[PDB]
Design an enzyme around this catalytic site. Sequence first.
Site, mmCIF file in Angstrom:
data_model
loop_
_atom_site.group_PDB
_atom_site.id
_atom_site.type_symbol
_atom_site.label_atom_id
_atom_site.label_comp_id
_atom_site.label_asym_id
_atom_site.label_seq_id
_atom_site.Cartn_x
_atom_site.Cartn_y
_atom_site.Cartn_z
ATOM 1 C CB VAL A 188 -13.665 6.673 22.533
ATOM 2 C CG1 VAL A 188 -14.556 7.920 22.320
ATOM 3 C CG2 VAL A 188 -12.837 6.466 21.380
ATOM 4 C CB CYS A 189 -8.812 9.391 23.028
ATOM 5 S SG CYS A 189 -7.683 9.089 24.475
ATOM 6 C CB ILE A 190 -13.558 11.529 20.354
ATOM 7 C CG1 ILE A 190 -13.178 10.725 19.129
ATOM 8 C CG2 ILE A 190 -14.511 12.564 19.868
ATOM 9 C CD1 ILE A 190 -14.143 9.594 18.862
#
Length: 164
Positions: free
Chosen positions: A87-89
């Site tokens: 995920v892109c966090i």
Amino acid sequence: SPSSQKALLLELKGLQEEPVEGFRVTLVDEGDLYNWEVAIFGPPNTYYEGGYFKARLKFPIDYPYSPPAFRFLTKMWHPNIYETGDVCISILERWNPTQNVRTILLSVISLLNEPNTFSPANVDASVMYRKWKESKGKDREYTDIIRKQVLGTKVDAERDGVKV
Ligand SMILES: COCC(=O)N[C@@H](Cc1ccc(-c2cc(Cl)cc(Cl)c2)cc1)[C@H](O)[C@@H](O)C(=O)O
């Protein structure tokens, strides 16, 4: 005894007593404090509604001085989620010893509800999403895919005995 242990048992309890809306947190079946199952439900009035999505948090021994890792197990089509589930966090704005699982979970809901097509993780999902928004949702290709994954998850719900 690792400092992390007590911080995680407390954080687990907090989230089981006051869940983040849509999320349900437990340990994996072997009881590893450092590896959490996350069950995620699509909210009413969205294309995710009726969804059952599964993800995992893997915590390091030195938590919270280092961040856990978050990964979808369910395959998901989204400008910000990799083929792999990663995920892109950012916060994994950057990580602190004062950030916590509750904030991670809210920043997943935020990535979910407002995709960043600037630096995509899934570039085809990303360009397909810009086109969808462009059309003011008149164009059905992106929401077709989401709808299919959502229906797919009803199989996972049934295998796991959930409860949608
Ligand atoms: C392409 O499908 C996009 C979609 O359905 N977007 C929604 C945003 C949105 C809302 C909630 C989630 C969400 C929230 C949680 Cl708690 C879990 C899951 Cl699986 C999805 C994701 C996106 C809607 O546009 C939004 O305006 C709304 O109805 O609130």
